[PDB]
Structure 1
Amino acid sequence: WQENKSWNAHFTEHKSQGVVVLWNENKQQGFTNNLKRANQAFLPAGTFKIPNSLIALDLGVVKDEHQVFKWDGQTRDIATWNRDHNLITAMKYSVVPVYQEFARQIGEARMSKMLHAFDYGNEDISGNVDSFWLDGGIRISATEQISFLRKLYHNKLHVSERSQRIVKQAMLTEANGDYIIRAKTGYDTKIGWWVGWVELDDNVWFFAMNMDMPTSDGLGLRQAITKEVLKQEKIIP
């Protein structure tokens, strides 16, 4: 690990504070603007959708990325959530209710063993089985996110290869002639996250970032700041 405090300007430029962590797969070297925050554990919030999805797929709770998860009929504040979804759209719109259902079907016991097998965060699911990642005991650091993602990238997680490929499909966020980004955002009403990786022709750059988000105002900076960092490091144009 190498600390690059210069990356801090990206946060200050935006009257914000946080951490960005990068991992160069080819070189097995990591970078961050704050070695400490890089290791501060936080509630994963939406980013937990990645493991929740893997678990659901492996247990059959989710058949594939096409399967329809019919809306339960309860209108919620976020418009996009009040409709039928599939893994793809459920990830894109961060549809909590769908995932809460997955969690319930998964159940405490299977969830707990699964997170342990994944070596995910503090592996604690205390609280409601269908809300622990949002207001429970589970906590994960950015470096931890990276360790987890690297396993996923390489299909080394303790679930079927198929489940892993499907989740990676569902993580698709951006792609063009220069790179591909597979990631997941999160927001716990205090902290905002963006975790994933940038696929290049001959390398992969894993990333995990989090930042203070007192207001849903700046959710956009999660992606904005990260890219400024990627651009700065010449990972993307």
Structure 2
Amino acid sequence: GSITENTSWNKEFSAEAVNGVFVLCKSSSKSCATNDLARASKEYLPASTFKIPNAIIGLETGVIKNEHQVFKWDGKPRAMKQWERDLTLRGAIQVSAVPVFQQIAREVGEVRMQKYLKKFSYGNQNISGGIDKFWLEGQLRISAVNQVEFLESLYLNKLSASKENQLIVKEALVTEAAPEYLVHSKTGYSTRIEPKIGWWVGWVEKETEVYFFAFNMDIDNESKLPLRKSIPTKIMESEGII
């Protein structure tokens, strides 16, 4: 594919003193727009955005039994009170229940995990660093361009997984719905390797058009985290995606 710089987008980043990139593609990833050619292809830890491939692989390997799977809490202490409860797949995504996804990865195992990430062309495809933490502090890395390519394949049911499993994950990623406007999206925040990276990736359907998007930025402190959503939203609104 082909990626074209929109210089007018930078004002959005400089105004807040952000180093970041936004990639946005209408209809397909054949042709994408960005504020920064270089950074659009730079690879970073996925952090919780990896919950998207992880869920697909969990379903594809039968570790997650089906769409109605309940991840049962055994009652032993977890790090966050929001995690101390039985969860659905969507629930685990909404509360960012890392430990649920860790147990999924352990059950998938390194051999199967490595195979699906290569079939999915998922970032640098490197799962070194321990089966439960490679996407949090190991060697895996992916770019904003690669995230849009991956999400486009998921939208099209073109990943190397059943259509049923791709539909199941897609439903769990819906974050906004209206009669002719539907958003699928996912945040991430990588804090374990410097610089810290904030993500927001997804796609938007508006009438009969679709737009795939991925945003990342350097995160100085937690107070900057809302810009992950507000900068990309402002740019998308500038394209009439409202």
Shorter-chain TM-score: which interval?
Answer: over 0.9
1:234 maps to amino acid: G
TM-score, scaled to structure 1:
0.95
1:108 maps to amino acid: E
Q: Matched residue of 1:94: which SS?
A: coil
Give the aligned partner of residue 104 of structure 1.
106
Determine the C-alpha separation between the residues in 2 that align with 1:81 and 1:213: 25
Count of residues in Structure 1 that have an aligned counterpart in Structure 2? 236
Task: Give the gaps of 5 or more residues in structure 2.
Answer: none
Contact persistence 1:65–1:88 (CA under 8 A): no
Determine the C-alpha separation between the residues in 1 that align with 2:160 and 2:113: 13
Give the aligned partner of residue 211 of structure 1.
217
- Once superposed, what is the RMSD of the aligned Cα atoms? 1.5
Contact persistence 2:29–2:149 (CA under 8 A): no
Q: Matched residue of 2:165: which SS?
A: helix
Shift of the 74–135 alpha-carbon distance from structure 1 to 2, 3 Å rule, reads farther
Contact persistence 1:64–1:87 (CA under 8 A): no
Give the aligned partner of residue 75 of structure 1.
77
Identical counterparts, % of pairs? 51
Q: Matched residue of 2:157: which SS?
A: coil
The alignment status of 1:202 with 2:208, answered yes or no, reads yes
CA drift of 1:25 comes to 1.2
Determine the C-alpha separation between the residues in 2 that align with 1:69 and 1:175: 26
Shift of the 177–8 alpha-carbon distance from structure 1 to 2, 3 Å rule, reads farther
TM-score, scaled to structure 2:
0.93
Pick the aligned partner of 2:198 from 180, 192, 196.
Answer: 192
Determine the C-alpha separation between the residues in 2 that align with 1:70 and 1:13: 45
Determine the C-alpha separation between the residues in 2 that align with 1:142 and 1:174: 22
Q: CA-to-partner distance for each residue in 1:111-133, whole Å, 9 max, x for gaps?
A: 00110111111100001101100
Give the aligned partner of residue 95 of structure 1.
97
Equivalent residues in 2 for 1:60-209, closer than 5 Å: 60-189=62-191, 190-209=196-215
Q: Matched residue of 1:156: which SS?
A: coil
